[PDB]
Design a protein around this ligand. Structure first.
Ligand SMILES: CC(C)(C)c1ccc(-c2nc3ccccc3c(=O)[nH]2)cc1
Ligand SMILES: [Zn+2]
Length: 208
């Protein structure tokens, strides 16, 4: 029941989604090892993900969290990178998309920095790079990210450098406390707390 609606670059919706990609790029402490070396992207396509059943699954859970948290879903738009982007848009988020070895435990992880999510496009640590060239820093191959609606509800705040939420909470916020440029990262423990709104196809660009 998933259809993908192709957006025009003339559409203000495309523009604001792209602006969110580009402006949340940062340098990484691995010097580009996982995600490649780039300051910006070449956005090839942005598609809206329409799945009624997955959307209704999302809103049902959203209303539940909201009601446990003074009518406040605490909803964000966050990036997600994964080799399983394609299963996610058709079948939705579930336990097979969880990062078992993550620093905040076995859950599904999201990023405010698009470039953080980019490090996961080819696997943990960027795996072995793109399938074609085995290059983690490939400038040729097409990459895909999700820009997702995420229900955080009451988030356990964790200062720093599948399972359950900490009791009394609906998610975990990893606050950065070493790198002053890093944006927050987030973990949900139920697939229903995220909807894969936008599929963005792109290339990282070789810096000049
Ligand atoms: C274990 C698999 C391969 C399913 C997987 C693990 C972690 C991510 C993933 N982690 C992240 C961790 C922090 C911030 C953003 C992300 C992100 O955007 N993605 C994606 C897939
Ligand atoms: Zn490649």
């Amino acid at each position: 029941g998933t259809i993908l609606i192709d957006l025009s670059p003339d559409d203000k919706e495309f523009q604001s989604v792209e602006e969110e990609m580009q402006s949340t790029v940062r340098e990484h402490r691995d010097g580009g090892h996982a995600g490649g070396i780039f300051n910006r992207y070449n956005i090839l396509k942005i598609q809206k993900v329409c799945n009624k059943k997955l959307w209704e699954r999302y809103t049902h859970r959203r209303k539940e969290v909201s009601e446990e948290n003074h009518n406040h879903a605490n909803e964000r738009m966050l990036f997600h990178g994964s080799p399983f982007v394609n299963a996610i848009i058709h079948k939705g988020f579930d336990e097979r998309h969880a990062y078992i070895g993550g620093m905040f435990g076995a859950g599904i992880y999201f990023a405010e920095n698009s470039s953080k999510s980019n490090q996961y496009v080819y696997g943990i640590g960027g795996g072995t790079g793109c399938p074609v060239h085995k290059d983690r820093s490939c400038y040729i191959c097409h990459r895909q990210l999700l820009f997702c609606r995420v229900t955080l509800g009451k988030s356990f705040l964790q200062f720093s450098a599948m399972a359950h939420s900490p009791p009394g909470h609906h998610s975990v916020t990893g606050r950065p406390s070493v790198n002053g440029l890093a944006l927050a990262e987030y973990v949900i423990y139920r697939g229903e707390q995220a909807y894969p709104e936008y599929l963005i196809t792109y290339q990282i660009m070789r810096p000049e």
